[model samples]
Target: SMKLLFVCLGNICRSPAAEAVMKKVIQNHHLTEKYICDSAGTCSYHEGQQADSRMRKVGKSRGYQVDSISRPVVSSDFKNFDYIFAMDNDNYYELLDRCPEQYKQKIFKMVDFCTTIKTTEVPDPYGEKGFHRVIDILEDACENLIIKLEEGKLIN
Candidate 1:
């Protein structure tokens, strides 16, 4: 099975949304049996918490399960996940710092899959930022991710 782990500063926002979006995309594509997605935090500041209400609302209203429990990325994730997507530059750095050197190549920026968005990072929808905008960005990225996976473009 293929596995993806989304990472952010806190598991309650961007990463979870990415996870939820990925799940829906996989299911809709009927690739659910072949792939699975989960999410984690770079830090455990919100460990064991549910996602942000705003994020949950946007995700649920958009028909995705945004209810994943918050947790920190562990060493085992490097071994288990085929890919680890960091929501932003700092999140990517933290993953690199903690990731085993051999598995470091599996880590990538979440926005790298986007076919439409111009951003280098998925904006943290923490406070004043727009949660819906994040969804648009993620929707674009997740679709392209699946496309790239199907094309086997990430391997070379």
Candidate 2:
């Protein structure tokens, strides 16, 4: 089995949203026995909280439940998950900073798997009408990600 961790700055917005959408993809594809995922933040500022209500509403409306509690990325995660996907550049760089040098290969931008949206980062929805776009990107990205995994592509 493979494990993945979705990461963002605060965990309430993009990260949890990605996790929800990724989980949906796994279930829909009947890959539950082969794949697992979780979400975390780069910062512990909002740790232990639910996904932001506004974003959660948008995600839930799309059939993706952003119900994960907030938590910061921890040391063990670098060794535990096969891939640690960052929502944006800052989130990506932050993980690079905290993760041990060798295992850095496990970190990557989540949107790199996107088959539609063309961007380097998935922006925060906390301040804009970006929730729909976020989900749009995740929907495409997560599905494509699973496709790659099924085809035996490694993050490297």
Candidate 3:
């Protein structure tokens, strides 16, 4: 099985959105059984809470269900997931700082897998009108990511 973890600052907005969007992609491709996807926050501010309401609303409007609880990144995640995708540079650096040397190569910026957008980060939508835009970016990135994994036979 292939495992993936999407991470952001609070996990209430971006990361959970990515997780749901990725799940939608996996389900559409009929690869659900071959992959395990999850999400996390870099901080503990909103731990155990659901994703932001605005994000969930925007995602649901697009048929992506955002239903993940917030949690901070843990050490074991580095060893558990084949890919740990950060939504932005700050969180990416946080993951890098917490991750062991052996797991460093598995970390990536979420937008790096995007084929449609020329971006390096998925901007936070906590206090902005970027929720819908973030979902758009995630859908493109997640779809491309699935394609990459399939092309490489990375999933069973």
Once fitted onto the true fold, the runs of candidate 2 whose alpha carbons sit more than 4 angstroms away are 126-128
lDDT value, candidate 2, whole model: 0.89
Give candidates' CA RMSD values in order.
Answer: 1.6, 1.4, 2.5
Clashes of each: 0, 0, 0
How much lDDT does each candidate structure score? 0.89, 0.89, 0.89
lDDT of 2 by residue, 66-149 (tens): 889999888999999999999999888889988898798899899889877887899776544689988888998999999988
Put down candidate 1 lDDT per residue, 26-138, tens digits, no spaces.
88899999898999998878899998888998888889889889999989999999999999999889899999999998999999898888999998765434898898899
Off by over 4 Å in 3: 126-128, 153-156
Rank the candidate models, highest lDDT first: 2, 1, 3
- State the displacement of the C-alpha of residue 35, model 1, in Å, after optimal TM-score superposition: 0.6
Off by over 4 Å in 1: 126-129, 153-156
| Candidate 3 lDDT, 27-82, residue by residue in tens | 99999999989999889888999888888888888998899999998899899999
